[PDB]
């Protein structure tokens, strides 16, 4: 949904 970082 609303990610802080790219490695999700």
């Amino acid at each position, epitope marked *: 949904g609303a990610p*802080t970082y*790219s490695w999700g």
Partner: antibody
Amino acid sequence: EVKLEESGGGLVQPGGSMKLSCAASGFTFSDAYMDWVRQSPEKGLEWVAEIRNKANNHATFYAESVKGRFTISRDDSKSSVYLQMNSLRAEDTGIYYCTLQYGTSSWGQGTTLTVSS
Amino acid sequence: DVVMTQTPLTLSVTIGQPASISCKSSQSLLYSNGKTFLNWLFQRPGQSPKRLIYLVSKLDSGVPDRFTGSGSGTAFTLKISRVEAEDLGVYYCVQGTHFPLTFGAGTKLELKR
């Protein structure tokens, strides 16, 4: 509502050990990465450690300053994430936050660690 | 790894007037999949940081509309259209493109007299 509540802070001597615990609720805990961040006047906000979800076999990652001294773990059944901290130093002093920064952002109230003789 | 530089370290603001703060990254925050993982956190004294902005310009749930994020590559800006009393505190930019997650040293919004 996403809730993170940390405990296990306190005063410890250099060389000493402390375990931080974080009880999470309000999201599917199994599926989230969990991240610890700390805050001190002198270093500001610093990422400390990450533990990944069951899919990534709970893969653990550490800041260079903390590698070999800290261990991040998780109990999927209790929705809890932990940070075992060994060989503590003065520079580890600060406020430790349990955070969800996986597909969203949520920060706990934090727990204070003081490393002093 | 990625160094985040915030200018001004302190901004003096009048309630009712706009604010603008800058964030610069030591390398591009553009990711392979086209996304740019720049976040803005806000911290009140004695309180935990709280994310306002993600993916450069997207507002978190319940964040007032006076907050706007912009930028690309290595240069980013947070703007407040009209400062309110609740907005006083420290703003941090946070880079989520390159492992480890890395933070600016913060910008303190202080009251002009």
